[PDB]
Amino acid sequence: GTGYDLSNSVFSPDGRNFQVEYAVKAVENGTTSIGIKCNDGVVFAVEKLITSKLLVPQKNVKIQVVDRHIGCVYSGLIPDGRHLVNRGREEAASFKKLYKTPIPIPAFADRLGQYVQAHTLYNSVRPFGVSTIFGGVDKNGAHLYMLEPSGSYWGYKGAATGKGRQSAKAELEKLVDHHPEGLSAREAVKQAAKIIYLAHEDNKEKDFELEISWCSLSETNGLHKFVKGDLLQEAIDFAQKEIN
Amino acid sequence: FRNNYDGDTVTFSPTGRLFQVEYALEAIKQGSVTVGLRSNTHAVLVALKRNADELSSYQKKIIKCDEHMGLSLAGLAPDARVLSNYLRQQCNYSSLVFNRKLAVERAGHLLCDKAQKNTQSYGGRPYGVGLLIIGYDKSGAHLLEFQPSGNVTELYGTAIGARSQGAKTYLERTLDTFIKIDGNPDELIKAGVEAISQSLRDESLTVDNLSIAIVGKDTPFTIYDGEAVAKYI
Amino acid sequence: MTDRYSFSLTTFSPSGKLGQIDYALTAVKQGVTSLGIKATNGVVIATEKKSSSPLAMSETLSKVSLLTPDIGAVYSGMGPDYRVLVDKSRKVAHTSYKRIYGEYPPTKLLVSEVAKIMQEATQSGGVRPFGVSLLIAGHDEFNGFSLYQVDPSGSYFPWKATAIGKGSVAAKTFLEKRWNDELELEDAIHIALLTLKESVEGEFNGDTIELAIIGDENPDLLGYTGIPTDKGPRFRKLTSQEINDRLEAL
Amino acid sequence: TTTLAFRFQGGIIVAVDSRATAGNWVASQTVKKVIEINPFLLGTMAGGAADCQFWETWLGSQCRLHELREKERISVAAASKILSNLVYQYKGAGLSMGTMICGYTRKEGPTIYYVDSDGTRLKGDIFCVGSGQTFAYGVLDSNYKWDLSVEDALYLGKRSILAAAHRDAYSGGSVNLYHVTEDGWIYHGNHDVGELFWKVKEEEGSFNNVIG
Amino acid sequence: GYDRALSIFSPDGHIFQVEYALEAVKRGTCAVGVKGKNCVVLGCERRSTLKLQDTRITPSKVSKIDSHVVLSFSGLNADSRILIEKARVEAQSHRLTLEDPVTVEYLTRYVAGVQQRYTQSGGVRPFGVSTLIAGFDPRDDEPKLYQTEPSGIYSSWSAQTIGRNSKTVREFLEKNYDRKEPPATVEECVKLTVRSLLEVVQTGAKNIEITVVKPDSDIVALSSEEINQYVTQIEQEKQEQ
Amino acid sequence: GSRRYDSRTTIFSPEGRLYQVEYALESISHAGTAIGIMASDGIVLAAERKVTSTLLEQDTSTEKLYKLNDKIAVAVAGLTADAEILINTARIHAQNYLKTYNEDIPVEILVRRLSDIKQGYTQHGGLRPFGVSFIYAGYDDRYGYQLYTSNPSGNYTGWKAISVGANTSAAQTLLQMDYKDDMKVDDAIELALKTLSKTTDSSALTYDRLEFATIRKGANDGEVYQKIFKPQEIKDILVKTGIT
Amino acid sequence: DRGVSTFSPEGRLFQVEYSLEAIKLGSTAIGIATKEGVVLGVEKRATSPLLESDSIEKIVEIDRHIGCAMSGLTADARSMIEHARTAAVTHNLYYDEDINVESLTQSVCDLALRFGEGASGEERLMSRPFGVALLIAGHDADDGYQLFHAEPSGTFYRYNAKAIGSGSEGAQAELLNEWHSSLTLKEAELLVLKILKQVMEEKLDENNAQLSCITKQDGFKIYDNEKTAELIKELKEKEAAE
Amino acid sequence: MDIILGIRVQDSVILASSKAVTRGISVLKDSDDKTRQLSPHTLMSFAGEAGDTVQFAEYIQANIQLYSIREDYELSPQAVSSFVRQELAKSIRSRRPYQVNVLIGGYDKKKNKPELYQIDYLGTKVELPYGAHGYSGFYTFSLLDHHYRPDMTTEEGLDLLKLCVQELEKRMPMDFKGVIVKIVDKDGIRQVDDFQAQ
Numbered sequence A: 001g002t003g004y005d006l007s008n009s010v011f012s013p014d015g016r017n018f019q020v021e022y023a024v025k026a027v028e029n030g031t032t033s034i035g036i037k038c039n040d041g042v043v044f045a046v047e048k049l050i051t052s053k054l055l056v057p058q059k060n061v062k063i064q065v066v067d068r069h070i071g072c073v074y075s076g077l078i079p080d081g082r083h084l085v086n087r088g089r090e091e092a093a094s095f096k097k098l099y100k101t102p103i104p105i106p107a108f109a110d111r112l113g114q115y116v117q118a119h120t121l122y123n124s125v126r127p128f129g130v131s132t133i134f135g136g137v138d139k140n141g142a143h144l145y146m147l148e149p150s151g152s153y154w155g156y157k158g159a160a161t162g163k164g165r166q167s168a169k170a171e172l173e174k175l176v177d178h179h180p181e182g183l184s185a186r187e188a189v190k191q192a193a194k195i196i197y198l199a200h201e202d203n204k205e206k207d208f209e210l211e212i213s214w215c216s217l218s219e220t221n222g223l224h225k226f227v228k229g230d231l232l233q234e235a236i237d238f239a240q241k242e243i244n
Numbered sequence B: 001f002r003n004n005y006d007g008d009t010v011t012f013s014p015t016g017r018l019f020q021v022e023y024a025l026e027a028i029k030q031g032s033v034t035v036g037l038r039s040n041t042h043a044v045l046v047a048l049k050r051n052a053d054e055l056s057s058y059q060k061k062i063i064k065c066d067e068h069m070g071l072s073l074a075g076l077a078p079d080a081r082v083l084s085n086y087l088r089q090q091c092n093y094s095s096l097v098f099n100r101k102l103a104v105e106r107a108g109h110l111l112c113d114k115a116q117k118n119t120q121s122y123g124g125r126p127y128g129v130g131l132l133i134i135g136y137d138k139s140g141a142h143l144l145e146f147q148p149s150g151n152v153t154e155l156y157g158t159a160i161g162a163r164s165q166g167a168k169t170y171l172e173r174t175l176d177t178f179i180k181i182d183g184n185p186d187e188l189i190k191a192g193v194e195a196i197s198q199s200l201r202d203e204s205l206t207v208d209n210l211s212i213a214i215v216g217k218d219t220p221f222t223i224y225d226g227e228a229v230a231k232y233i
Numbered sequence C: 001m002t003d004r005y006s007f008s009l010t011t012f013s014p015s016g017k018l019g020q021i022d023y024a025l026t027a028v029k030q031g032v033t034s035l036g037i038k039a040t041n042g043v044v045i046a047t048e049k050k051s052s053s054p055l056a057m058s059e060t061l062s063k064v065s066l067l068t069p070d071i072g073a074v075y076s077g078m079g080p081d082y083r084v085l086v087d088k089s090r091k092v093a094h095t096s097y098k099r100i101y102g103e104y105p106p107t108k109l110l111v112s113e114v115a116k117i118m119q120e121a122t123q124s125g126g127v128r129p130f131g132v133s134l135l136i137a138g139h140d141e142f143n144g145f146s147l148y149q150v151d152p153s154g155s156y157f158p159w160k161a162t163a164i165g166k167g168s169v170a171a172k173t174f175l176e177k178r179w180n181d182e183l184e185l186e187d188a189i190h191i192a193l194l195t196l197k198e199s200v201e202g203e204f205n206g207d208t209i210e211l212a213i214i215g216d217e218n219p220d221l222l223g224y225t226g227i228p229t230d231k232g233p234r235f236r237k238l239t240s241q242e243i244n245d246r247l248e249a250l
Numbered sequence D: 001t002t003t004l005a006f007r008f009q010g011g012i013i014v015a016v017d018s019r020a021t022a023g024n025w026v027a028s029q030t031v032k033k034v035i036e037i038n039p040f041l042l043g044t045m046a047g048g049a050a051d052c053q054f055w056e057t058w059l060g061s062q063c064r065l066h067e068l069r070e071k072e073r074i075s076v077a078a079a080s081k082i083l084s085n086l087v088y089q090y091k092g093a094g095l096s097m098g099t100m101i102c103g104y105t106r107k108e109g110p111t112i113y114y115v116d117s118d119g120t121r122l123k124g125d126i127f128c129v130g131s132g133q134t135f136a137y138g139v140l141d142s143n144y145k146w147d148l149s150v151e152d153a154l155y156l157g158k159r160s161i162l163a164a165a166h167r168d169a170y171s172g173g174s175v176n177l178y179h180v181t182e183d184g185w186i187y188h189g190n191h192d193v194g195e196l197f198w199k200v201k202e203e204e205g206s207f208n209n210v211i212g
Numbered sequence E: 001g002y003d004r005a006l007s008i009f010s011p012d013g014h015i016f017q018v019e020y021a022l023e024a025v026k027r028g029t030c031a032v033g034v035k036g037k038n039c040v041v042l043g044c045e046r047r048s049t050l051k052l053q054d055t056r057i058t059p060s061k062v063s064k065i066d067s068h069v070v071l072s073f074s075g076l077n078a079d080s081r082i083l084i085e086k087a088r089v090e091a092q093s094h095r096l097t098l099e100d101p102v103t104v105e106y107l108t109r110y111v112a113g114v115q116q117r118y119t120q121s122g123g124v125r126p127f128g129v130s131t132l133i134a135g136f137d138p139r140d141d142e143p144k145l146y147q148t149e150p151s152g153i154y155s156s157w158s159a160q161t162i163g164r165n166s167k168t169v170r171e172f173l174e175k176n177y178d179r180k181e182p183p184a185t186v187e188e189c190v191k192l193t194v195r196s197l198l199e200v201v202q203t204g205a206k207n208i209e210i211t212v213v214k215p216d217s218d219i220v221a222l223s224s225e226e227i228n229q230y231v232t233q234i235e236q237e238k239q240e241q
Numbered sequence F: 001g002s003r004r005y006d007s008r009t010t011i012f013s014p015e016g017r018l019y020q021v022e023y024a025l026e027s028i029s030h031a032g033t034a035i036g037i038m039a040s041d042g043i044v045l046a047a048e049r050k051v052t053s054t055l056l057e058q059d060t061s062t063e064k065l066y067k068l069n070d071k072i073a074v075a076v077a078g079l080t081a082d083a084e085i086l087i088n089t090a091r092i093h094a095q096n097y098l099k100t101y102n103e104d105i106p107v108e109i110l111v112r113r114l115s116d117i118k119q120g121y122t123q124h125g126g127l128r129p130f131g132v133s134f135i136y137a138g139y140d141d142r143y144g145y146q147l148y149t150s151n152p153s154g155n156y157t158g159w160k161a162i163s164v165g166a167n168t169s170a171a172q173t174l175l176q177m178d179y180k181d182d183m184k185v186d187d188a189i190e191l192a193l194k195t196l197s198k199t200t201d202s203s204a205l206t207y208d209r210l211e212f213a214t215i216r217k218g219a220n221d222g223e224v225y226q227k228i229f230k231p232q233e234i235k236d237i238l239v240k241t242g243i244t
Numbered sequence G: 001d002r003g004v005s006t007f008s009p010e011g012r013l014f015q016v017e018y019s020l021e022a023i024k025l026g027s028t029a030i031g032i033a034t035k036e037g038v039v040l041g042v043e044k045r046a047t048s049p050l051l052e053s054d055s056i057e058k059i060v061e062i063d064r065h066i067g068c069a070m071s072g073l074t075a076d077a078r079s080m081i082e083h084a085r086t087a088a089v090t091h092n093l094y095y096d097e098d099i100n101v102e103s104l105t106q107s108v109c110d111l112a113l114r115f116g117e118g119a120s121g122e123e124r125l126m127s128r129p130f131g132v133a134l135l136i137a138g139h140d141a142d143d144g145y146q147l148f149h150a151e152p153s154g155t156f157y158r159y160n161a162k163a164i165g166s167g168s169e170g171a172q173a174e175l176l177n178e179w180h181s182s183l184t185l186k187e188a189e190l191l192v193l194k195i196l197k198q199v200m201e202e203k204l205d206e207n208n209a210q211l212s213c214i215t216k217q218d219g220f221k222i223y224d225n226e227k228t229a230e231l232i233k234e235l236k237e238k239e240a241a242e
Numbered sequence H: 001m002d003i004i005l006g007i008r009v010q011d012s013v014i015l016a017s018s019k020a021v022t023r024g025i026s027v028l029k030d031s032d033d034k035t036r037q038l039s040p041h042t043l044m045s046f047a048g049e050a051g052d053t054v055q056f057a058e059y060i061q062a063n064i065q066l067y068s069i070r071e072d073y074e075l076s077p078q079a080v081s082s083f084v085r086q087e088l089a090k091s092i093r094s095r096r097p098y099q100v101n102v103l104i105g106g107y108d109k110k111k112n113k114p115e116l117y118q119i120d121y122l123g124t125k126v127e128l129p130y131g132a133h134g135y136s137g138f139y140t141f142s143l144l145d146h147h148y149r150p151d152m153t154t155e156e157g158l159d160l161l162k163l164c165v166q167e168l169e170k171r172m173p174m175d176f177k178g179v180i181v182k183i184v185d186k187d188g189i190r191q192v193d194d195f196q197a198q
């Protein structure tokens, strides 16, 4: 029959979970955001649409940090995004408290992964309306990760999600090809600003605000930090220049 | 279509929408207009109080949460009481435990997370009220716009409620002007009354009809009603 | 989260039927045949090991199970449901009897216990009945040997012999013809193998058939000596080789 | 502390002292050991201050609620059982209160109930409770008659507390009188033991031992 | 675990589950109560869909909550038990804590509350029962008669009836009972009740049971004969005309 | 959520009826007939075994007559499984009454408890009622021989003669036609069998399709006795009453 | 079905709205406040002549300075009244003072939205909203005489005069004209007694109508029949007077 | 302790109980009735801890009356006592046990015989011709052990009690202020108001 899309834990006859699929819709509809894994860290950037001149500039920050070494950015239902990060924070804290060592990016990934997958198991809950790009540096290098409402996630060299997800994925792939030896944290910040500016064409209607953050072993001592001031403008420029 | 995906908040529509949440957002539009705007020294709230008969009172739209924070509501009164009351506790807890004033930005993050919880669990319902929180903290004056969806945003000014679009455009225009109204509360207030009259239609703001609130540098959040607002009409 | 299914999933229809229990029985009908025969000095139960792939090893799966050392069970219906039912039936035997009286429960009661479990899956909130019917056979000092059939409804009854599953009607008829109140265990075993052959399409041997008995005490199967009153289990599953030998005298 | 309540023809007489201590240290001579539960109910207070004062005030609230509910003045016997039962819920916990619940309902007439943190609830005509009870009993017992003028009963009471205040180190301060009639209780002033003693001595000629 | 809101509001502002509860009452046997000048009487009809019962044991229609108070009902029996129990238990609790038996009005207000509660509590359906509670307040002689319904509402009546054909008998009573001069006698009071039941009982000597309550816990239920007699004397009243 | 699959087994019909109780009864109407007759010197319980076979081990069977106490027993009609669940709690209740008062539980008291348990599944819980109806046959020193009946609704009543299960209407008419207050156990025993005989949906009323029980006070003793006839005992009484 | 706490696409709560309907069907209740006191009046509405009209209680006392009138499903009012009484008495126990009439009202209003089948915000156990509205009248030293309207919505207003129940919309219209800042208590009494007579299907008499009031001096009192009757008689004469 | 005596004669059970209520140094009351009627033909006398004493008695009463109404029947004395024992027996292993001892005297309307039950806070129950709780036992059991006969009339029984009360006043330390006597029989429970000089 039909109606296999009214409850969250139901399998359609072809083996799907429409509710989860409908969630992905809420995501694709959201702003665009990316992650670039450089050779000793990860860079995060996001598209911040300026709905009006009323929004205090530089104020409604999107990228979130978990603990001190992990960075999170997501596209879709922001509130769901935060909800997830809160859980990640508790999740990371619980971990450190028992094992002392700050939670390894991979372990954290599956920590968020199992939680999210958990919301595709019961009809009493709604799946997450967000895709999340997150990562950081740990005992063995840097890691970039993307998590889907389905709970699925994998390690990426580059990742993008949202409205301009394709333009991005397009650009990210170009990078991967023209840099087999790796990209530097400094360079990834620039390239990210560009890739965000390009992906902004599928929303060229409203003006936006760029927001980059990175976690580099050599640049930030393995700590997640927001790219501000000079280095920021410098990237905004490197992008503004190549958009013409 | 929509009829099969709006029976509760734990259901997504084939397009990624959460109707029950949207229906809640509607209750706000059906609500009486209220305006918020701030300079660098003060933040202000102006709200239109709506009454039932002419034998009834006008319902309060502004609520104080602390000596440095407060807000205006549009929508389900009860829900504002619940949310404001919860925002009072948070300010309270911030003091009692850290001897620290709860930053406006954080109060917002708190509201957002509280709201969000009523939009992913069976049995719960979203809050049918919009809020405009103003406050003065360690980083200055602030204005927040709270939506039942959970979306909280910091702006220089804004409005919500029926015909709110009027005032909002007016502020969006007056921006560069009121944002510089420092060291002068009365000026920031008049700019606030103007923005709000931009959403009038039915009548004109009277003394037992207008409601104003202000917080700032050396100004504890204080609400003005009746005779007190007379000097602005 | 939280099982919000605090209401019955099995209810009365205007006709007075209990849907799920009926459907559950239908599920039993579809399952492989299995039967039980009570002789004057033992009981036998058997079914067919319907290997669901030539690559799968049918030994690593028993349709015939020991509940206590003097009670065995066999089913027809949904294998997985039976599995958990066995574990439950083995535990309940301890928790509600051996731990209180220091002796294994008598057949009727253990059966009574399992029945209750199923009965509950017919009324409890948020669950479906068990898709299996059981044939339990055992022996106890004050009741001798006995054979019982337990249904997804939670009902059970004693039998001199009977069968359930696929060709039950056929086999049930064949048993009414061959059973008498003077059968020795070996007799029933024979009749069992015959009654089984009918429901068997392809191969019929000790590797495709699974049969056990509840006869005399096997002290050789006790594992230890030195205690007069402990004589060994009456339950014993036949070996593949033991089955084939009998099949020649078929 | 000394508190006493007795029933007689004119109704009920209630008198108490007003001294509060913490060991040998006199904390106060101005305590109100009589709690006016309501225009018709009185509660004496002996034992732990807080314990009596708190729980008796609470009793007032329960009595008020009972009348809102039943649209009728609560009975003395019921009021006394409420305290009684509440107190028993805390048996063994350490509450310390010996109290009297006195009232006048058209149904029961003059009534007095003795209630202590032990769970003991008793109805009677005379009750003396407190570290000075025996002294009060001494005087009272030997001069009580159901036929006392509301004036003489008032005196006998005032005098019974005077005795206790004198002999007992833990009693004193001042006397507080109350007269219980169906129309309710009528306060009868605060009499400072300081000045009351002498006056009584002279006028009555008793306390002949003391020198003055 | 189960807390489904079964009694909710519908567009027209009704709570159908409570309304349907009433329908269950309408289908129940008839029960009537009339207060005299010094007594109250309760009468109830006995169904006849099957007759071969053992009237000795079979639960009767009028129950004693306490020695001075009784309660009769119309509706689902299974449900009446639950109410009668709670009432009886509260009857003792009130004595134990207030050292005084419950007033007829109070016991009523309690029962009504239970019912009301069941109309706005999760996972439960309202009581398909309506009650008649009568007796005499402690140390009082003015008879009491109250009635409650699934909605949780209650009130006092000089006389009243509930159940099937209660419409009919109520009429009978509305034009046969004068508040000015209430049945000044236990006898003339029971007669008025038997009369009122006959309007619907359709000759049922063994189908009509009467219970008389007087001040100071004087409760008694008449036998078939005492009743049969009343029916007798009444049938003549008709013929003698 | 879950509300989507909730049958709401405990609600009223617009007519003020209880759906499930009604339907449950509907189910019971198809169950083997059980009859209870009460004579001056004893009570009789006769029931018809639903579904039987040549192979059915009849000596070891019981599907309708259950012993609850030493002076109380019941005849069932409906889901045996359900019946048991209730019978066991009944057996316990009897014992507790004994343990508390050191006296045998009064028949009606046991019957009221059982009925109350049923009534419950009728007013709250969201579960289905028990598809059972009981004919209680017992004796105590307060009301002597008693006969009661209870069903899914939770209501119970007393009888001189009564039946439950299938063709009750037919049986009730036959009983109502030949019952007399001054009957004797033997008489009742006959009337019982005669009735079944005339209502049986089967060919002939043979012993292998019956369950019989009598509560008599064996004069040569002074105590009451419960006798649940064995296959042969039924086969005999069956020939005697002239049904061979 | 559909959640008991579901939103309509218009931004309203179904159950709450439907709740308001059941109330329109309720008995008429009117309240008028004057600088001399507040008057509360209600329609008994006996569903039969055998029903002892005085056992009809639709005007109750919350405290000595706070009373109220109810309309709609009145059985629902019991738990609210109990709550109100307790809150008022408790406040007195905790603060040694009377509770403000507004807070008393605000307190009642807080129970209102406490319903659902699992609403994420606390433990709201009550399957449906209340099917009754309340007119809370009283006095305190902070805002003098006050009249409040509390609906199952969870909100409440303060009226100089307000009428709820079947005859409301019309009666309220009447009050819109009749009421003025200088009415006397006596005036408000007849006015209530008048508007009641208009909207009542029944011929208003001292047995199907009931008056009461709250004055700083004597508190909440319910006019005994005799007192009401005379007031009625008085009303008739002044009416027939022109 | 207080004085709780019970003696079962031919057709009735007589219960005697001290009227004194002493708290520490002062005797607060001299007319205390340490008894509760459980039903028209069952009377229970009690003595023990200050609060527990009545709390337990009333509780038992409530429950017995509730059973009376529910069953419109009066439980036999034997049954009533079994209920009581159970209750105490539970109590003893609870968080805070009832420290009460009781005598239960009733007339079994069915057997038509009077009965006396003695039960202590431990739930120890025994049926006796005569019994007492506390110290009284030490002075009275020998008296009764001596002057007791099963066929004694109610009057003889009273005299026998009179004998016990005297010994108790003679040899006991405490002033128990006399006793209140009550008789339970076929016609119910009644109090011998003239024993202060009978």
Ligand SMILES: */C1=C\C(=O)NCCCC[C@H](NC(=O)[C@@H](NC(=O)N[C@H](C(=O)O)C(C)C)C(C)C)C(=O)N[C@H]1C(C)C
Pocket (backbone or CB within 6 Å): D001, D002, D019, D020, D021, D022, D027, D031, D033, D045, D046, D047, D048, D049, D050, D052, D130, D131, D170
């Ligand atoms: C009556 C005297 C009496 O009956 N007994 C003598 C005992 C003194 C009790 C009481 N004194 C007080 O209540 C003290 N405060 C405390 O005792 N506080 C205690 C503490 O701090 O350890 C706590 C644990 C209760 C005074 C300072 C309030 C007393 O004076 N009783 C009088 C009468 C009732 C006022």
